[model samples]
Target: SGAIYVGNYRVVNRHLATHNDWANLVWEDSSRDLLVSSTTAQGCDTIARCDCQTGVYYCSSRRKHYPVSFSKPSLIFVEASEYYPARYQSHLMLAVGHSEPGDCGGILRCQHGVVGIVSTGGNGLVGFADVRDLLWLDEE
Candidate 1:
Protein backbone atom coordinates (compact mmCIF):
# COMPACT_ATOMS: atom_id res chain seq x y z
CA SER A 1 0.00 0.00 0.00
CA GLY A 2 2.59 2.50 1.14
CA ALA A 3 0.08 5.27 1.48
CA ILE A 4 0.39 8.17 3.87
CA TYR A 5 -2.72 9.46 5.65
CA VAL A 6 -2.39 13.22 5.24
CA GLY A 7 -3.74 14.28 8.61
CA ASN A 8 -2.72 16.57 11.42
CA TYR A 9 -2.47 14.23 14.41
CA ARG A 10 0.35 12.17 15.81
CA VAL A 11 -1.35 9.93 18.37
CA VAL A 12 -4.72 9.13 19.83
CA ASN A 13 -5.34 9.31 23.55
CA ARG A 14 -8.16 6.79 23.81
CA HIS A 15 -10.83 4.83 21.96
CA LEU A 16 -13.64 4.23 24.37
CA ALA A 17 -17.26 3.34 23.86
CA THR A 18 -20.02 5.27 25.54
CA HIS A 19 -23.35 3.88 26.80
CA ASN A 20 -23.88 2.01 23.55
CA ASP A 21 -21.53 0.17 21.21
CA TRP A 22 -22.28 2.64 18.48
CA ALA A 23 -20.94 5.50 20.57
CA ASN A 24 -17.21 4.96 20.09
CA LEU A 25 -15.17 7.96 21.12
CA VAL A 26 -11.59 8.77 20.06
CA TRP A 27 -9.32 11.38 21.56
CA GLU A 28 -6.16 12.75 19.97
CA ASP A 29 -3.17 14.23 21.75
CA SER A 30 -1.94 17.79 21.25
CA SER A 31 -2.12 18.65 17.56
CA ARG A 32 0.94 20.03 15.80
CA ASP A 33 -0.88 22.92 14.16
CA LEU A 34 -1.91 25.48 16.77
CA LEU A 35 -4.58 27.13 14.60
CA VAL A 36 -5.91 23.79 13.36
CA SER A 37 -9.32 22.96 11.97
CA SER A 38 -12.47 22.38 14.05
CA THR A 39 -14.22 19.79 16.28
CA THR A 40 -17.96 20.53 16.06
CA ALA A 41 -18.63 20.23 12.32
CA GLN A 42 -21.78 20.82 10.33
CA GLY A 43 -24.20 18.03 9.45
CA CYS A 44 -24.79 19.19 5.88
CA ASP A 45 -22.18 21.10 3.98
CA THR A 46 -20.08 20.91 0.81
CA ILE A 47 -17.20 18.91 2.20
CA ALA A 48 -13.60 18.38 1.09
CA ARG A 49 -11.43 15.37 1.92
CA CYS A 50 -7.91 13.96 1.51
CA ASP A 51 -7.11 10.56 2.99
CA CYS A 52 -5.11 7.47 2.08
CA GLN A 53 -8.07 5.89 0.30
CA THR A 54 -10.16 8.75 -1.05
CA GLY A 55 -7.19 10.91 -1.98
CA VAL A 56 -7.55 14.65 -2.70
CA TYR A 57 -11.23 14.97 -3.61
CA TYR A 58 -14.30 16.80 -2.37
CA CYS A 59 -17.98 15.90 -2.38
CA SER A 60 -20.42 17.84 -4.46
CA SER A 61 -23.00 18.84 -1.87
CA ARG A 62 -24.85 17.62 1.22
CA ARG A 63 -28.41 16.48 0.70
CA LYS A 64 -30.38 16.60 3.98
CA HIS A 65 -29.36 16.72 7.61
CA TYR A 66 -31.60 14.07 9.15
CA PRO A 67 -32.12 10.51 7.92
CA VAL A 68 -28.31 10.86 7.52
CA SER A 69 -27.70 10.98 3.76
CA PHE A 70 -24.77 12.05 1.48
CA SER A 71 -23.84 11.93 -2.18
CA LYS A 72 -20.88 12.26 -4.59
CA PRO A 73 -21.60 14.02 -7.88
CA SER A 74 -18.69 13.09 -10.15
CA LEU A 75 -21.27 11.75 -12.62
CA ILE A 76 -23.59 12.45 -9.72
CA PHE A 77 -22.25 10.53 -6.72
CA VAL A 78 -24.63 9.65 -3.93
CA GLU A 79 -24.42 7.56 -0.75
CA ALA A 80 -27.84 7.26 0.81
CA SER A 81 -29.09 5.47 3.92
CA GLU A 82 -29.69 1.83 3.09
CA TYR A 83 -32.29 1.21 5.76
CA TYR A 84 -35.51 3.08 5.75
CA PRO A 85 -35.93 5.51 8.60
CA ALA A 86 -32.24 4.95 9.22
CA ARG A 87 -31.05 6.43 12.44
CA TYR A 88 -27.97 5.93 14.64
CA GLN A 89 -29.03 6.03 18.30
CA SER A 90 -25.76 7.72 19.11
CA HIS A 91 -25.46 11.09 17.46
CA LEU A 92 -21.80 10.29 16.92
CA MET A 93 -22.49 7.60 14.32
CA LEU A 94 -22.17 9.02 10.82
CA ALA A 95 -23.42 6.63 8.13
CA VAL A 96 -22.18 6.28 4.56
CA GLY A 97 -23.65 3.89 2.00
CA HIS A 98 -22.40 2.30 -1.24
CA SER A 99 -18.99 1.76 0.28
CA GLU A 100 -16.60 -1.18 0.19
CA PRO A 101 -14.63 -2.85 2.99
CA GLY A 102 -11.84 -0.60 4.22
CA ASP A 103 -9.83 0.00 7.33
CA CYS A 104 -11.45 1.86 10.18
CA GLY A 105 -10.08 4.89 12.08
CA GLY A 106 -9.99 6.62 8.69
CA ILE A 107 -10.96 10.18 9.44
CA LEU A 108 -13.34 12.28 7.29
CA ARG A 109 -12.68 15.92 6.54
CA CYS A 110 -14.36 19.07 5.36
CA GLN A 111 -13.19 22.45 4.12
CA HIS A 112 -12.88 23.72 7.67
CA GLY A 113 -11.36 20.62 9.33
CA VAL A 114 -11.95 17.15 10.67
CA VAL A 115 -15.51 15.87 10.93
CA GLY A 116 -15.83 12.12 11.35
CA ILE A 117 -13.86 8.92 11.84
CA VAL A 118 -14.56 5.41 10.58
CA SER A 119 -15.78 3.50 13.63
CA THR A 120 -18.33 0.88 12.58
CA GLY A 121 -20.27 -0.36 9.60
CA GLY A 122 -20.65 -3.28 7.16
CA ASN A 123 -22.61 -4.58 4.15
CA GLY A 124 -22.11 -1.62 1.86
CA LEU A 125 -22.48 0.80 4.74
CA VAL A 126 -19.86 2.23 7.06
CA GLY A 127 -20.46 4.72 9.80
CA PHE A 128 -18.04 7.27 11.22
CA ALA A 129 -17.78 8.86 14.62
CA ASP A 130 -18.91 12.41 14.02
CA VAL A 131 -16.29 14.01 16.25
CA ARG A 132 -18.44 17.08 16.58
CA ASP A 133 -21.24 15.54 18.62
CA LEU A 134 -18.95 13.45 20.81
CA LEU A 135 -17.75 16.42 22.88
CA TRP A 136 -16.36 19.88 22.40
CA LEU A 137 -13.05 21.15 23.75
CA ASP A 138 -11.25 24.45 24.11
CA GLU A 139 -7.46 24.77 24.05
CA GLU A 140 -5.17 27.55 25.21
Candidate 2:
Protein backbone atom coordinates (compact mmCIF):
# COMPACT_ATOMS: atom_id res chain seq x y z
CA SER A 1 0.00 0.00 0.00
CA GLY A 2 2.99 2.29 0.40
CA ALA A 3 3.71 2.79 -3.28
CA ILE A 4 4.45 6.12 -4.95
CA TYR A 5 6.42 7.49 -7.88
CA VAL A 6 7.79 10.93 -8.70
CA GLY A 7 8.31 11.73 -12.32
CA ASN A 8 10.15 14.70 -13.77
CA TYR A 9 7.84 17.64 -14.44
CA ARG A 10 8.26 21.09 -15.98
CA VAL A 11 7.39 24.68 -15.20
CA VAL A 12 4.76 25.45 -17.76
CA ASN A 13 3.94 28.80 -16.08
CA ARG A 14 5.48 30.98 -13.39
CA HIS A 15 6.30 34.46 -12.17
CA LEU A 16 10.00 35.28 -12.35
CA ALA A 17 11.43 36.24 -8.95
CA THR A 18 12.94 39.41 -10.39
CA HIS A 19 9.45 40.59 -11.31
CA ASN A 20 7.32 40.02 -8.21
CA ASP A 21 7.36 40.69 -4.47
CA TRP A 22 5.84 37.85 -2.44
CA ALA A 23 3.47 37.37 -5.39
CA ASN A 24 2.48 35.03 -8.25
CA LEU A 25 1.15 31.48 -8.87
CA VAL A 26 4.04 30.12 -11.00
CA TRP A 27 2.15 27.14 -12.28
CA GLU A 28 3.75 23.95 -13.52
CA ASP A 29 3.15 20.34 -14.46
CA SER A 30 2.43 17.96 -11.52
CA SER A 31 5.11 15.69 -10.00
CA ARG A 32 5.00 12.04 -8.99
CA ASP A 33 7.20 13.13 -6.12
CA LEU A 34 4.61 15.72 -5.07
CA LEU A 35 2.41 12.90 -3.83
CA VAL A 36 4.85 12.01 -1.03
CA SER A 37 7.38 13.49 1.37
CA SER A 38 9.22 16.80 1.27
CA THR A 39 12.36 14.95 0.17
CA THR A 40 13.02 12.47 -2.62
CA ALA A 41 15.56 9.77 -3.62
CA GLN A 42 18.82 10.93 -2.04
CA GLY A 43 20.99 10.75 -5.16
CA CYS A 44 18.26 11.06 -7.74
CA ASP A 45 17.72 14.44 -9.35
CA THR A 46 14.27 16.04 -9.29
CA ILE A 47 12.66 16.97 -12.58
CA ALA A 48 13.23 20.60 -11.65
CA ARG A 49 17.00 20.29 -11.30
CA CYS A 50 19.34 21.56 -13.98
CA ASP A 51 22.60 23.53 -14.37
CA CYS A 52 22.45 26.74 -12.35
CA GLN A 53 18.93 25.84 -11.33
CA THR A 54 16.98 28.35 -9.30
CA GLY A 55 13.99 27.88 -6.90
CA VAL A 56 13.29 24.14 -6.53
CA TYR A 57 13.43 23.10 -2.81
CA TYR A 58 13.03 20.08 -0.51
CA CYS A 59 13.45 18.89 3.07
CA SER A 60 17.22 18.73 3.58
CA SER A 61 17.11 18.12 7.33
CA ARG A 62 15.57 14.69 7.05
CA ARG A 63 18.18 11.97 7.70
CA LYS A 64 15.69 9.30 6.76
CA HIS A 65 13.27 8.93 3.88
CA TYR A 66 10.32 10.05 5.94
CA PRO A 67 6.90 10.40 4.38
CA VAL A 68 4.84 13.59 4.76
CA SER A 69 1.93 13.84 7.18
CA PHE A 70 -1.13 15.63 5.77
CA SER A 71 -2.07 17.38 8.91
CA LYS A 72 -4.38 20.40 9.33
CA PRO A 73 -4.02 22.86 6.48
CA SER A 74 -2.36 26.20 7.16
CA LEU A 75 -5.03 28.84 6.69
CA ILE A 76 -5.05 32.58 7.52
CA PHE A 77 -3.14 34.82 5.09
CA VAL A 78 0.18 33.02 5.52
CA GLU A 79 2.57 35.37 7.29
CA ALA A 80 0.03 38.09 6.73
CA SER A 81 0.26 37.47 3.01
CA GLU A 82 -2.78 38.49 0.97
CA TYR A 83 -5.44 36.07 -0.18
CA TYR A 84 -4.69 34.28 -3.43
CA PRO A 85 -5.78 36.61 -6.23
CA ALA A 86 -7.75 34.03 -8.12
CA ARG A 87 -11.42 33.10 -8.60
CA TYR A 88 -11.06 29.37 -9.00
CA GLN A 89 -8.98 28.03 -6.14
CA SER A 90 -9.59 24.32 -5.99
CA HIS A 91 -6.17 24.40 -4.30
CA LEU A 92 -5.18 25.35 -0.75
CA MET A 93 -2.07 27.25 0.37
CA LEU A 94 0.43 26.01 2.92
CA ALA A 95 3.01 27.93 4.94
CA VAL A 96 6.65 26.82 5.06
CA GLY A 97 10.14 28.27 5.59
CA HIS A 98 13.87 28.06 4.63
CA SER A 99 12.82 28.90 1.09
CA GLU A 100 12.88 32.09 -0.99
CA PRO A 101 10.80 33.82 -3.67
CA GLY A 102 12.31 31.70 -6.37
CA ASP A 103 11.27 28.74 -4.27
CA CYS A 104 7.63 28.92 -5.35
CA GLY A 105 6.39 25.92 -7.34
CA GLY A 106 8.26 23.31 -5.33
CA ILE A 107 6.27 20.85 -3.24
CA LEU A 108 5.67 21.64 0.48
CA ARG A 109 5.34 18.73 2.87
CA CYS A 110 5.31 18.70 6.68
CA GLN A 111 6.16 15.19 7.90
CA HIS A 112 4.48 12.06 6.55
CA GLY A 113 2.24 13.26 3.71
CA VAL A 114 1.94 15.88 0.98
CA VAL A 115 0.42 19.31 1.49
CA GLY A 116 1.09 21.93 -1.15
CA ILE A 117 3.63 23.41 -3.59
CA VAL A 118 5.28 26.82 -3.44
CA SER A 119 2.63 29.07 -4.94
CA THR A 120 3.84 32.31 -3.36
CA GLY A 121 6.48 33.59 -0.94
CA GLY A 122 8.42 36.36 0.86
CA ASN A 123 10.89 36.70 3.77
CA GLY A 124 11.50 32.94 3.75
CA LEU A 125 7.79 32.39 4.52
CA VAL A 126 6.20 30.59 1.56
CA GLY A 127 2.68 29.83 0.35
CA PHE A 128 1.98 26.48 -1.27
CA ALA A 129 -0.60 25.02 -3.67
CA ASP A 130 -2.42 21.90 -2.51
CA VAL A 131 -1.05 18.61 -3.85
CA ARG A 132 -4.54 17.16 -3.63
CA ASP A 133 -5.76 19.93 -5.90
CA LEU A 134 -2.92 19.40 -8.36
CA LEU A 135 -3.13 15.63 -8.57
CA TRP A 136 -6.76 15.81 -9.55
CA LEU A 137 -5.86 18.16 -12.39
CA ASP A 138 -3.10 16.00 -13.84
CA GLU A 139 -4.15 12.44 -13.02
CA GLU A 140 -7.55 13.20 -14.46
Candidate 3:
Protein backbone atom coordinates (compact mmCIF):
# COMPACT_ATOMS: atom_id res chain seq x y z
CA SER A 1 0.00 0.00 0.00
CA GLY A 2 2.20 2.74 -1.34
CA ALA A 3 -0.56 5.29 -1.19
CA ILE A 4 0.62 8.87 -1.19
CA TYR A 5 -0.64 11.03 1.69
CA VAL A 6 -0.20 14.05 -0.60
CA GLY A 7 -0.52 17.51 0.96
CA ASN A 8 2.71 18.77 2.51
CA TYR A 9 4.68 15.62 3.27
CA ARG A 10 7.60 15.78 5.68
CA VAL A 11 9.81 13.26 7.46
CA VAL A 12 7.16 13.52 10.19
CA ASN A 13 5.38 10.71 8.33
CA ARG A 14 8.28 8.44 9.18
CA HIS A 15 7.21 8.26 12.83
CA LEU A 16 3.47 8.74 12.31
CA ALA A 17 2.89 6.78 9.10
CA THR A 18 2.03 3.74 11.17
CA HIS A 19 -1.78 3.87 11.34
CA ASN A 20 -1.84 0.22 12.38
CA ASP A 21 -2.93 1.08 15.91
CA TRP A 22 -5.39 3.81 16.77
CA ALA A 23 -3.88 3.51 20.20
CA ASN A 24 -0.52 3.02 18.50
CA LEU A 25 0.23 6.56 19.78
CA VAL A 26 0.82 7.90 16.26
CA TRP A 27 -2.73 7.85 14.89
CA GLU A 28 -3.86 10.10 17.72
CA ASP A 29 -6.30 12.69 16.36
CA SER A 30 -5.05 16.25 15.88
CA SER A 31 -7.76 17.34 18.28
CA ARG A 32 -6.12 15.17 20.91
CA ASP A 33 -3.32 16.93 22.81
CA LEU A 34 -0.89 14.06 22.42
CA LEU A 35 2.81 14.14 21.57
CA VAL A 36 4.86 11.52 19.68
CA SER A 37 8.36 12.20 20.95
CA SER A 38 9.01 13.88 24.27
CA THR A 39 12.52 14.84 23.21
CA THR A 40 14.13 17.53 25.35
CA ALA A 41 13.07 20.68 23.54
CA GLN A 42 13.42 24.23 24.82
CA GLY A 43 11.87 27.53 24.00
CA CYS A 44 13.38 29.78 21.27
CA ASP A 45 14.19 26.65 19.30
CA THR A 46 14.10 27.57 15.60
CA ILE A 47 11.23 25.29 14.50
CA ALA A 48 9.37 25.26 11.21
CA ARG A 49 5.75 24.37 10.53
CA CYS A 50 2.63 25.33 8.59
CA ASP A 51 -0.53 27.00 9.90
CA CYS A 52 -3.71 24.98 10.01
CA GLN A 53 -6.83 26.05 8.08
CA THR A 54 -7.19 28.98 10.45
CA GLY A 55 -3.60 29.84 9.57
CA VAL A 56 -2.96 30.21 13.28
CA TYR A 57 0.59 29.56 14.40
CA TYR A 58 0.58 27.83 17.78
CA CYS A 59 3.87 28.47 19.53
CA SER A 60 4.86 26.55 22.65
CA SER A 61 7.43 29.15 23.50
CA ARG A 62 6.82 32.76 24.62
CA ARG A 63 8.56 34.48 21.69
CA LYS A 64 5.31 35.74 20.27
CA HIS A 65 7.09 39.00 19.49
CA TYR A 66 8.04 37.72 16.03
CA PRO A 67 5.61 37.75 13.16
CA VAL A 68 4.17 34.37 12.17
CA SER A 69 6.22 33.00 9.32
CA PHE A 70 4.30 31.18 6.60
CA SER A 71 7.54 29.40 5.79
CA LYS A 72 8.45 27.97 9.20
CA PRO A 73 7.06 28.18 12.74
CA SER A 74 9.04 28.07 15.97
CA LEU A 75 8.13 26.86 19.48
CA ILE A 76 9.09 29.04 22.42
CA PHE A 77 8.62 27.19 25.72
CA VAL A 78 6.76 29.59 27.94
CA GLU A 79 5.18 29.19 31.35
CA ALA A 80 3.12 26.07 31.89
CA SER A 81 -0.04 28.15 31.77
CA GLU A 82 1.08 29.79 28.51
CA TYR A 83 0.23 26.83 26.29
CA TYR A 84 -2.82 26.89 24.07
CA PRO A 85 -6.20 26.04 25.51
CA ALA A 86 -6.71 22.41 26.53
CA ARG A 87 -9.59 22.06 24.08
CA TYR A 88 -7.65 22.95 20.94
CA GLN A 89 -5.99 20.57 18.51
CA SER A 90 -2.21 20.05 18.60
CA HIS A 91 -0.11 17.39 16.86
CA LEU A 92 3.66 16.89 16.66
CA MET A 93 6.15 14.50 14.99
CA LEU A 94 9.69 14.10 16.26
CA ALA A 95 12.74 13.11 14.19
CA VAL A 96 14.43 11.01 16.88
CA GLY A 97 13.05 7.62 17.92
CA HIS A 98 12.62 6.04 21.37
CA SER A 99 16.15 4.69 21.46
CA GLU A 100 17.06 6.10 24.83
CA PRO A 101 16.28 4.28 28.11
CA GLY A 102 13.98 5.24 31.00
CA ASP A 103 12.48 8.76 30.92
CA CYS A 104 15.78 9.49 29.19
CA GLY A 105 13.92 8.38 26.07
CA GLY A 106 12.31 10.90 23.71
CA ILE A 107 9.54 13.27 24.80
CA LEU A 108 5.76 13.32 24.37
CA ARG A 109 2.86 15.59 25.45
CA CYS A 110 -0.94 15.61 25.00
CA GLN A 111 -3.33 18.41 25.94
CA HIS A 112 -6.93 19.18 25.10
CA GLY A 113 -7.72 17.08 22.01
CA VAL A 114 -4.94 18.23 19.66
CA VAL A 115 -1.65 16.38 19.69
CA GLY A 116 1.46 18.55 19.76
CA ILE A 117 4.11 17.74 17.15
CA VAL A 118 7.58 18.05 18.66
CA SER A 119 10.49 17.89 16.22
CA THR A 120 13.78 17.46 18.03
CA GLY A 121 16.04 17.12 14.96
CA GLY A 122 14.98 20.60 13.86
CA ASN A 123 13.31 21.24 10.49
CA GLY A 124 10.22 21.18 12.65
CA LEU A 125 7.83 21.07 9.77
CA VAL A 126 4.08 21.23 10.57
CA GLY A 127 1.07 19.69 8.85
CA PHE A 128 -1.61 21.97 7.47
CA ALA A 129 -5.12 20.59 7.67
CA ASP A 130 -6.89 20.53 4.31
CA VAL A 131 -9.76 22.97 4.12
CA ARG A 132 -11.70 21.01 1.49
CA ASP A 133 -11.49 17.83 3.49
CA LEU A 134 -12.74 19.55 6.63
CA LEU A 135 -15.58 21.08 4.64
CA TRP A 136 -16.68 17.83 3.02
CA LEU A 137 -16.63 16.05 6.35
CA ASP A 138 -18.73 18.79 7.86
CA GLU A 139 -21.32 18.36 5.07
CA GLU A 140 -24.22 16.06 5.81
Candidate 4:
Protein backbone atom coordinates (compact mmCIF):
# COMPACT_ATOMS: atom_id res chain seq x y z
CA SER A 1 0.00 0.00 0.00
CA GLY A 2 1.14 3.48 -0.74
CA ALA A 3 1.11 5.51 2.43
CA ILE A 4 1.21 9.20 1.77
CA TYR A 5 4.41 10.98 2.63
CA VAL A 6 4.23 13.37 5.54
CA GLY A 7 7.64 14.43 6.84
CA ASN A 8 11.31 14.42 5.91
CA TYR A 9 11.45 10.72 4.91
CA ARG A 10 8.69 8.69 3.29
CA VAL A 11 6.60 6.64 5.69
CA VAL A 12 7.00 2.87 5.52
CA ASN A 13 5.22 0.40 7.78
CA ARG A 14 8.21 -1.82 8.40
CA HIS A 15 9.78 -3.14 11.59
CA LEU A 16 13.38 -2.09 11.88
CA ALA A 17 14.37 -5.55 13.15
CA THR A 18 13.23 -7.14 9.91
CA HIS A 19 16.48 -6.03 8.40
CA ASN A 20 18.30 -8.56 10.59
CA ASP A 21 17.78 -11.15 13.32
CA TRP A 22 17.82 -9.86 16.91
CA ALA A 23 16.94 -11.61 20.19
CA ASN A 24 17.81 -9.16 22.96
CA LEU A 25 16.37 -5.89 21.66
CA VAL A 26 13.53 -4.14 23.49
CA TRP A 27 11.66 -1.01 22.67
CA GLU A 28 11.41 1.79 25.16
CA ASP A 29 8.04 1.50 26.97
CA SER A 30 6.89 4.89 25.67
CA SER A 31 8.79 5.15 22.41
CA ARG A 32 10.26 3.18 19.48
CA ASP A 33 13.81 3.74 20.67
CA LEU A 34 15.98 1.05 22.29
CA LEU A 35 17.89 0.49 25.51
CA VAL A 36 20.62 -2.11 25.04
CA SER A 37 22.79 -3.93 27.55
CA SER A 38 26.04 -5.90 27.32
CA THR A 39 24.39 -9.33 27.37
CA THR A 40 22.38 -8.44 24.27
CA ALA A 41 24.74 -10.13 21.78
CA GLN A 42 28.27 -10.83 20.71
CA GLY A 43 28.15 -10.39 16.88
CA CYS A 44 25.80 -7.43 17.21
CA ASP A 45 24.45 -5.01 19.75
CA THR A 46 20.77 -4.42 20.49
CA ILE A 47 18.86 -2.43 17.94
CA ALA A 48 18.34 1.33 17.79
CA ARG A 49 16.52 3.15 15.01
CA CYS A 50 15.69 6.51 13.56
CA ASP A 51 12.24 7.78 12.68
CA CYS A 52 11.24 9.14 9.26
CA GLN A 53 12.98 12.47 9.71
CA THR A 54 16.63 11.99 10.56
CA GLY A 55 18.80 9.65 8.47
CA VAL A 56 22.18 10.12 10.12
CA TYR A 57 23.69 8.08 12.97
CA TYR A 58 25.39 9.22 16.18
CA CYS A 59 26.90 7.42 19.16
CA SER A 60 28.97 8.11 22.29
CA SER A 61 31.32 6.22 24.55
CA ARG A 62 29.88 7.45 27.87
CA ARG A 63 32.17 10.37 28.42
CA LYS A 64 32.38 14.15 28.12
CA HIS A 65 33.80 13.95 24.61
CA TYR A 66 31.65 14.86 21.60
CA PRO A 67 29.61 12.07 20.02
CA VAL A 68 30.74 10.61 16.69
CA SER A 69 28.71 10.57 13.48
CA PHE A 70 28.43 7.74 10.97
CA SER A 71 27.27 9.89 8.10
CA LYS A 72 26.82 6.97 5.73
CA PRO A 73 27.21 3.77 7.70
CA SER A 74 25.93 0.56 6.17
CA LEU A 75 26.50 -1.25 9.42
CA ILE A 76 27.14 -0.15 12.99
CA PHE A 77 29.33 -2.15 15.32
CA VAL A 78 28.97 -1.95 19.11
CA GLU A 79 31.85 -2.88 21.37
CA ALA A 80 31.73 -4.07 24.98
CA SER A 81 34.15 -5.66 27.40
CA GLU A 82 33.46 -8.81 29.41
CA TYR A 83 35.92 -7.55 32.00
CA TYR A 84 33.88 -4.43 32.74
CA PRO A 85 30.28 -3.48 33.41
CA ALA A 86 27.83 -2.68 30.61
CA ARG A 87 28.50 1.03 30.85
CA TYR A 88 32.25 0.64 30.53
CA GLN A 89 32.05 -1.49 27.37
CA SER A 90 29.96 0.66 25.06
CA HIS A 91 31.40 2.11 21.88
CA LEU A 92 30.59 2.51 18.16
CA MET A 93 31.65 0.53 15.06
CA LEU A 94 30.72 2.30 11.83
CA ALA A 95 30.87 0.83 8.34
CA VAL A 96 29.27 1.03 4.89
CA GLY A 97 27.68 -3.04 5.27
CA HIS A 98 29.27 -6.31 4.61
CA SER A 99 29.40 -8.50 1.44
CA GLU A 100 27.17 -5.89 -0.21
CA PRO A 101 26.65 -2.18 -0.71
CA GLY A 102 24.43 0.24 1.22
CA ASP A 103 24.39 2.96 3.83
CA CYS A 104 22.57 2.88 7.21
CA GLY A 105 22.79 3.29 10.99
CA GLY A 106 21.90 7.34 17.41
CA ILE A 107 22.62 8.35 20.51
CA LEU A 108 24.56 9.58 23.54
CA ARG A 109 25.96 6.86 25.81
CA CYS A 110 26.26 6.62 29.57
CA GLN A 111 27.84 3.15 29.71
CA HIS A 112 24.47 1.59 30.56
CA GLY A 113 22.38 2.48 27.52
CA VAL A 114 23.67 3.78 24.27
CA VAL A 115 20.79 5.58 22.62
CA GLY A 116 20.84 5.33 18.84
CA ILE A 117 19.00 7.49 16.35
CA VAL A 118 18.70 8.02 12.59
CA SER A 119 19.03 11.78 12.62
CA THR A 120 17.88 14.54 10.31
CA GLY A 121 21.24 16.21 10.01
CA GLY A 122 22.55 16.55 13.57
CA ASN A 123 23.49 14.46 16.61
CA GLY A 124 22.88 13.91 20.35
CA LEU A 125 19.49 12.83 21.74
CA VAL A 126 17.09 13.34 18.85
CA GLY A 127 14.50 10.85 20.11
CA PHE A 128 11.54 11.67 22.35
CA ALA A 129 10.57 10.22 25.71
CA ASP A 130 7.42 10.72 27.82
CA VAL A 131 7.25 14.26 29.14
CA ARG A 132 4.45 13.45 31.58
CA ASP A 133 6.70 13.74 34.56
CA LEU A 134 8.00 17.13 33.54
CA LEU A 135 4.49 18.31 32.74
CA TRP A 136 3.23 17.02 36.07
CA LEU A 137 5.98 18.86 37.87
CA ASP A 138 5.03 22.11 36.07
CA GLU A 139 1.35 21.64 36.96
CA GLU A 140 2.06 21.38 40.66
How well does each candidate superpose onto the true structure, as a TM-score? 0.35, 0.35, 0.21, 0.21
Cα displacement (angstroms), candidate 4, residue 126, comes to 4.3
- Sort by lDDT, best first: 2, 1, 3, 4
Off by over 4 Å in 2: 1-13, 16-90, 110-114, 138-140
Q: What lDDT score is found at residue 139 in candidate 3?
A: 18
Local accuracy of candidate 4 as per-residue lDDT tens digits, 17-104: 3322234332222122123211222222222333122222332322223433333222222222222222311122232212100111
> Which candidate wins on lDDT?
2
Model 4: per-residue Cα lDDT at residue 61: 28
Steric collisions counted per model: 4, 11, 33, 9
User: In model 3, which regions exceed 4 Å deviation?
Assistant: 1-54, 63-66, 69-121, 124-132
lDDT of 3 by residue, 1-140 (tens): 01111122111223243443233332223342222222122222212222332223233342221122222222322112222333333232222222111111122222211122332222343332221222221112
Tens-digit lDDT track for model 2 on 22-77? 13223332321123222222322222211121222353332222233332333334
Better of 3 and 4 by lDDT: 3
Query: What's the lDDT for residue 104 in model 1?
Result: 38
Ranking by TM-score: 2, 1, 3, 4
Winner by lDDT between candidate 4 and candidate 1: 1
lDDT of each: 0.31, 0.35, 0.25, 0.23
Sliding window of 10 residues with minimal summed lDDT for model 4: 95-104
